[PDB]
Amino acid sequence: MVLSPADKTNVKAAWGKVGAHAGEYGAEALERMFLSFPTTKTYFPHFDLSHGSAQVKGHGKKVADALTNAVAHVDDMPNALSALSDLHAHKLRVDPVNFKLLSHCLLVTLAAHLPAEFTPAVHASLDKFLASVSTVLTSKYR
Amino acid sequence: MVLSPADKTNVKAAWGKVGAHAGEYGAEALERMFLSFPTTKTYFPHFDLSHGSAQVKGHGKKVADALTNAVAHVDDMPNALSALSDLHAHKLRVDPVNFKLLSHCLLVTLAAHLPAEFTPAVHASLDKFLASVSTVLTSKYR
Amino acid sequence: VHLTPEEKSAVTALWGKVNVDEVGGEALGRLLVVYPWTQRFFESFGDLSTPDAVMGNPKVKAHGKKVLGAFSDGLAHLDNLKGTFATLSELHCDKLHVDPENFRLLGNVLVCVLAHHFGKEFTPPVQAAYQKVVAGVANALAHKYH
Amino acid sequence: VHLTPEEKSAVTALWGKVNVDEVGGEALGRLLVVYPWTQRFFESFGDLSTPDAVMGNPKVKAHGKKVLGAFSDGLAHLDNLKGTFATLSELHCDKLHVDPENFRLLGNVLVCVLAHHFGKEFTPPVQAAYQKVVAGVANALAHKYH
Numbered sequence: 167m168v169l170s171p172a173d174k175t176n177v178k179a180a181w182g183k184v185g186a187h188a189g190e191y192g193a194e195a196l197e198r199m200f201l202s203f204p205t206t207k208t209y210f211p212h213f214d215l216s217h218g219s220a221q222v223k224g225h226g227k228k229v230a231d232a233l234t235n236a237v238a239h240v241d242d243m244p245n246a247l248s249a250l251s252d253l254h255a256h257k258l259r260v261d262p263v264n265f266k267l268l269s270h271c272l273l274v275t276l277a278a279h280l281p282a283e284f285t286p287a288v289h290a291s292l293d294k295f296l297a298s299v300s301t302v303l304t305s306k307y308r
Numbered sequence: 309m310v311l312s313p314a315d316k317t318n319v320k321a322a323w324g325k326v327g328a329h330a331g332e333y334g335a336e337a338l339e340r341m342f343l344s345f346p347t348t349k350t351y352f353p354h355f356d357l358s359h360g361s362a363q364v365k366g367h368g369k370k371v372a373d374a375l376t377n378a379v380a381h382v383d384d385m386p387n388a389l390s391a392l393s394d395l396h397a398h399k400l401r402v403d404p405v406n407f408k409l410l411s412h413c414l415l416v417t418l419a420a421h422l423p424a425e426f427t428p429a430v431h432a433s434l435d436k437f438l439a440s441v442s443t444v445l446t447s448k449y450r
Numbered sequence: 451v452h453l454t455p456e457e458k459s460a461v462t463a464l465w466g467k468v469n470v471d472e473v474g475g476e477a478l479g480r481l482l483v484v485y486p487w488t489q490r491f492f493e494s495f496g497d498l499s500t501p502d503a504v505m506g507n508p509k510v511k512a513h514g515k516k517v518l519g520a521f522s523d524g525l526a527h528l529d530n531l532k533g534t535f536a537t538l539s540e541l542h543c544d545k546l547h548v549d550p551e552n553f554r555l556l557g558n559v560l561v562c563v564l565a566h567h568f569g570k571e572f573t574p575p576v577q578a579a580y581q582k583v584v585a586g587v588a589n590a591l592a593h594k595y596h
Numbered sequence: 597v598h599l600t601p602e603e604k605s606a607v608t609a610l611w612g613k614v615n616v617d618e619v620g621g622e623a624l625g626r627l628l629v630v631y632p633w634t635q636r637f638f639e640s641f642g643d644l645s646t647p648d649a650v651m652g653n654p655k656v657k658a659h660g661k662k663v664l665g666a667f668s669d670g671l672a673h674l675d676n677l678k679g680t681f682a683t684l685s686e687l688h689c690d691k692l693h694v695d696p697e698n699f700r701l702l703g704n705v706l707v708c709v710l711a712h713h714f715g716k717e718f719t720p721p722v723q724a725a726y727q728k729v730v731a732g733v734a735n736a737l738a739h740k741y742h
């Protein structure tokens with residue numbers, strides 16, 4: 167797939183609004199995933215997954231920054247997430263199915279926090295954006 | 309999803325051996341698919357899906373031929389399959405999930421007919437190749 | 451579905467605040483906008499040319515009320531969904547030819563809509579409860595496919 | 597699972613000809629080769645660097661035999677897969693931390709291997725019966741996840 171210019175405009179607008187809450191939204195998305203899709207917990211046996219744990223808060227922040235980086239370099243994601251792409255492919259080795267679950271929980275979080283901005287068109291653009299990030303992150307798996 | 313030179317070599321070699329039987333294997337893959345994953349039948353309400361149906365055999369040949377064309381243009385798949393991407397995206401509108409099911413059935417078909425050639429390395433290359441074809445076919449969905 | 455008493459009450463409690471017709475129209479419109487391939491069943495509905503046209507189409511809105519009203523009635527039978535949706539499952543398979551993946555898409559779009567509608571009240575545990583319900587309904591609807 | 601008498605006999609008939617040791621080894625080896633991320637559970641197994649390395653690895657062949665032998669056991673209890681696998685379900689979740697999606701990939705690779713091994717005898721109807729079995733097994737193993 168590919169993002170149209172209109173998609174990039176919607177993402178930039180919505181993400182811009184997240185602004186300084188990116189890390190807090192990042193943490194909430196993870197908590198929503200662990201609760202809704204418990205099988206994702208299999209990748210975090212080394213974490214205190216208790217609500218508000220610093221590990222989750224910290225991880226939520228690293229996830230948010232990476233999304234910020236991709237929004238910023240929306241026209242050259244492969245290059246922007248290169249490092250993350252290697253990490254997931256060669257070390258973490260998270261089954262590709264899990265990316266769709268996190269993407270869903272990130273969309274739900276954004277929805278819950280952006281009443282004005284979460285229109286059908288933006289919703290569509292964000293979904294596509296999350297799918298693209300997911301594709302870039304799993305692109306070096308095999 | 310990048311096809312290395314060895315992947316390309318593997319695919320051309322295996323498809324090479326399919327040769328004349330491509331259409332027969334295409335029909336067999338469809339049959340396997342309809343029996344194993346009945347939900348896929350929802351896209352062919354207009355077909356006689358019985359064993360030996362000429363419609364399935366006819367459709368099987370069209371699929372197999374498209375695959376042959378993909379192998380031939382393995383370096384330029386998007387352009388080679390352009391009309392097929394348009395078709396699936398804008399008219400047929402087959403849910404992307406289904407592509408994985410046909411791909412699996414094609415692999416099972418190849419396995420059952422190419423004992424010698426279906427090594428673990430070739431199996432991996434073919435799986436990557438069918439995932440690339442699927443990606444191309446769904447690239448214009450949204 | 452296996453929902454603890456707590457989960458059941460959380461589902462029931464939010465649902466009581468839902469304008470079924472409204473959310474129905476919204477959820478169905480958003481499905482057709484976010485996953486355009488789903489428009490394949492709706493060519494008789496008219497103009498689905500843009501998000502605005504989809505969201506504003508009276509046919510989409512009508513079909514949404516119909517779909518969500520059925521969903522809504524199902525909420526009363528959390529313990530017997532397969533039973534409750536058996537006839538509809540057969541209908542969707544035999545006459546309508548609807549790939550059950552569409553039920554899963556709609557369930558995810560429905561959760562996003564509730565999230566958008568309820569904001570902060572749609573907590574992680576309330577989401578989890580709704581996820582089990584939407585998966586349960588999708589499963590119940592796909593049950594009679596053959 | 598729900599198997600017709602003909603599906604049950606097809607499953608049973610083919611399985612009597614399977615050398616579990618040999619097929620188990622092949623199935624697990626092909627899993628690690630085709631979906632290399634699955635190697636993350638087998639860091640202590642040695643060299644999994646090449647297909648040849650993976651396929652002749654004795655720890656792979658050994659483990660493969662264990663897995664299919666346990667799989668063979670559920671074939672005997674097709675009517676109670678969850679009950680048969682409950683203990684191993686809890687083990688894989690709680691101690692092993694294996695994402696259940698891996699059970700699904702193994703199921704698919706196993707089908708490929710039976711087709712490779714049996715050729716023409718692995719007909720469309722036989723495959724279909726096996727696809728229901730492997731899905732049942734994967735489901736039985738993910739059952740106690742929490």
Ligand code: HEM
Binds near residue numbers: 228254269299300303
């Ligand atoms: C939108 C998709 C994702 C993004 C942007 C993302 C990003 C990141 C980042 C930035 C890191 C930290 C890198 C470092 O510290 O060097 C990381 C690590 C990690 N991610 Fe991913 N990730 C995503 C999806 C997933 C999914 C779906 C899972 C599993 C369900 C996952 C599991 C992990 C784990 C286990 C770690 C290491 C945790 C630790 O030990 O700190 N990731 N990811």
Ligand code: HEM
Binds near residue numbers: 392400410411
């Ligand atoms: C590797 C994947 C696939 C390839 C290469 C492929 C290729 C093709 C080709 C060559 C045609 C004929 C176009 C024409 O009529 O000119 C076609 C049509 C069609 N395909 Fe796909 N296809 C693939 C996957 C699928 C899947 C997974 C489904 C649904 C389960 C599907 C459903 C259909 C349908 C319903 C038609 C129209 C059939 C008719 O009415 O004659 N396709 N495809």
Ligand code: HEM
Binds near residue numbers: 538542552
């Ligand atoms: C919660 C999930 C769903 C429920 C409860 C549901 C329920 C219903 C009901 C109650 C009807 C009317 C049946 C009748 O005419 O007696 C119906 C019809 C129909 N539904 Fe479903 N539905 C669901 C999901 C879907 C989805 C996702 C699609 C397609 C993307 C779909 C496509 C249709 C179509 C095309 C009809 C026929 C409409 C007509 O003839 O006017 N449904 N559904």
Ligand code: HEM
Binds near residue numbers: 638662664698
């Ligand atoms: C058909 C599905 C499967 C069955 C029936 C099965 C069964 C078993 C059994 C019987 C054991 C031995 C427990 C013991 O004696 O300690 C085991 C261990 C194990 N399994 Fe599973 N297994 C299945 C699938 C998988 C998959 C797909 C993976 C990951 C790719 C996996 C990863 C493991 C690991 C890492 C161990 C521990 C090996 C060790 O002791 O180091 N299993 N499994």
